[PDB]
Amino acid sequence: ALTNAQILAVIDSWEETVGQFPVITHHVPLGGGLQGTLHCYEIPLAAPYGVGFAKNGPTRWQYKRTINQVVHRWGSHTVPFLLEPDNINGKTCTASHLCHNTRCHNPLHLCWESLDDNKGRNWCPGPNGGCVHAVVCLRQGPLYGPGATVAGPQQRGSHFVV
Amino acid sequence: ALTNAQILAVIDSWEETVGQFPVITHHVPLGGGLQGTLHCYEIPLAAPYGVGFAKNGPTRWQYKRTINQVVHRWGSHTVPFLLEPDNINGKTCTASHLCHNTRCHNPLHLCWESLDDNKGRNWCPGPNGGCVHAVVCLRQGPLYGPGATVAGPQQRGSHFVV
DNA sequence: TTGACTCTCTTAA
DNA sequence: GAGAGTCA
DNA sequence: TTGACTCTCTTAA
DNA sequence: GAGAGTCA
Ligand SMILES: [Mn+2]
Ligand SMILES: [Mn+2]
Ligand SMILES: [Zn+2]
Ligand SMILES: [Zn+2]
Ligand SMILES: [Zn+2]
Ligand SMILES: [Zn+2]
Incomplete structure (x- = not known):
C-alpha cells in the first residue's frame, strides 16, 4: 500500500x-447584511483540466497518479484529506465546499465531514449571521431565507389541535 | 377526483x-433553550391503518378513494393540499412535516413547499432560536447544532489564499 | 503513464 | 420526498 | 369496493 | 456527495 510519504507526495503534486x-x-453574503470576498481556484470547464485531472461527470472530477506502475485514482476534492479518518459516527466522510462552488479546488475552501453536515451548510445564516458550525462556514448558505412555501x-x- | 366538491369530500373523509x-x-426543542409540546396524530405501525389507507414503503403510505367507479390514489400526506398548485418556481411541491414525524398525519403539522425548503427545515434553529421561515417552523430542526466535522x-x- | 471519455452508485428528505 | 402494479 | 402487499422513481448535496 | 471501465 502507499506509504504516508507517498500519500504526502500525491497531496503535494495535487496542490x-x-x-x-x-x-x-x-463577492458573497456573510450574514447580518455583511458582504465578503472569497477566492476560488477553479478547474477549467473543458479538457484539458491539468496534469492528472479528468472529468467523470457534469460537475465531478478525479485525480489519477501512477506509482510503481500501479494506477491510483481519487475523487478530485478528497485529496487534501487522504491522511484523515474516512468515517465518523458510523457515517462516511465527504468533501464539503464551504464556498458552494463545485469547480473550486482551493483546499482552504474544503472540509471533511458527514453528508448531513455538508448538506446542512446550504441553509446556514453564515459566519456573521449566527453560524454555529464547529468548523465555521465561510459564507451564508445559498438557500438561507424565508423560502417559498405554497x-x-x-x-x-375541527378534529385537530396543534 | 375532478370536481372541487369531490376534492372537498376526499379531504373531509381523510380528516x-x-x-x-x-x-x-x-416534547420538542423550540430554540433558545425553550421546550414546547406538539400533538401528533400517528398512523398505526401495521395493518389495518384505517379506511382508505395502505402502506407502500417502510415510512410511506397512500390514501385511496373510489369516485365514479374510478380508483383515485394520492400520497397519504398530500391530501390536505389537493386544491393547491402542484409546482412552485418550476419545482414540484411536496408535503413537509413541521414535526419531522413521518407517521404523523395531523394537517396542522404539514405544509406544501419545494423539496429544498422541506429539507432545509432539518437545520432550522426553531421558532424561538431565529427561524426566518415565512411559514414558521413548529420546532428546532433535528440536525441543528455544531456538527461533527472530522x-x-x-x-x-503556501500556494493558496482564502 | 497519461488523457479523455464512458458507466453506475449513496443518502435522506 | 414520490407514482404505479398484483392479488384477494 | 376495499384491503394488503409488491416494485421502482426524484432531487441535490 | 462517490468508485470503476475502455481505448489508444
Ligand atoms: Mn456541500
Ligand atoms: Mn421534511
Ligand atoms: Zn472556492
Ligand atoms: Zn455554518
Ligand atoms: Zn406531527
Ligand atoms: Zn424555520
Whole structure:
C-alpha cells in the first residue's frame, strides 16, 4: 500500500497543479447584511483540466497518479484529506465546499465531514449571521431565507389541535 | 377526483379518518433553550391503518378513494393540499412535516413547499432560536447544532489564499 | 503513464 | 420526498 | 369496493 | 456527495 510519504507526495503534486488554476474573485453574503470576498481556484470547464485531472461527470472530477506502475485514482476534492479518518459516527466522510462552488479546488475552501453536515451548510445564516458550525462556514448558505412555501398548516373542520 | 366538491369530500373523509388516529404528545426543542409540546396524530405501525389507507414503503403510505367507479390514489400526506398548485418556481411541491414525524398525519403539522425548503427545515434553529421561515417552523430542526466535522480547511504548502 | 471519455452508485428528505 | 402494479 | 402487499422513481448535496 | 471501465 502507499506509504504516508507517498500519500504526502500525491497531496503535494495535487496542490501544485491546483495552485496554477485560475483564481476567481467572488463577492458573497456573510450574514447580518455583511458582504465578503472569497477566492476560488477553479478547474477549467473543458479538457484539458491539468496534469492528472479528468472529468467523470457534469460537475465531478478525479485525480489519477501512477506509482510503481500501479494506477491510483481519487475523487478530485478528497485529496487534501487522504491522511484523515474516512468515517465518523458510523457515517462516511465527504468533501464539503464551504464556498458552494463545485469547480473550486482551493483546499482552504474544503472540509471533511458527514453528508448531513455538508448538506446542512446550504441553509446556514453564515459566519456573521449566527453560524454555529464547529468548523465555521465561510459564507451564508445559498438557500438561507424565508423560502417559498405554497400553503401552510390548515384544517377544514375541527378534529385537530396543534 | 375532478370536481372541487369531490376534492372537498376526499379531504373531509381523510380528516375524519386521521382524526381517529391515536394522539401522541411529543416534547420538542423550540430554540433558545425553550421546550414546547406538539400533538401528533400517528398512523398505526401495521395493518389495518384505517379506511382508505395502505402502506407502500417502510415510512410511506397512500390514501385511496373510489369516485365514479374510478380508483383515485394520492400520497397519504398530500391530501390536505389537493386544491393547491402542484409546482412552485418550476419545482414540484411536496408535503413537509413541521414535526419531522413521518407517521404523523395531523394537517396542522404539514405544509406544501419545494423539496429544498422541506429539507432545509432539518437545520432550522426553531421558532424561538431565529427561524426566518415565512411559514414558521413548529420546532428546532433535528440536525441543528455544531456538527461533527472530522477535518477543516488546510494546506501543506503556501500556494493558496482564502 | 497519461488523457479523455464512458458507466453506475449513496443518502435522506 | 414520490407514482404505479398484483392479488384477494 | 376495499384491503394488503409488491416494485421502482426524484432531487441535490 | 462517490468508485470503476475502455481505448489508444
Ligand atoms: Mn456541500
Ligand atoms: Mn421534511
Ligand atoms: Zn472556492
Ligand atoms: Zn455554518
Ligand atoms: Zn406531527
Ligand atoms: Zn424555520
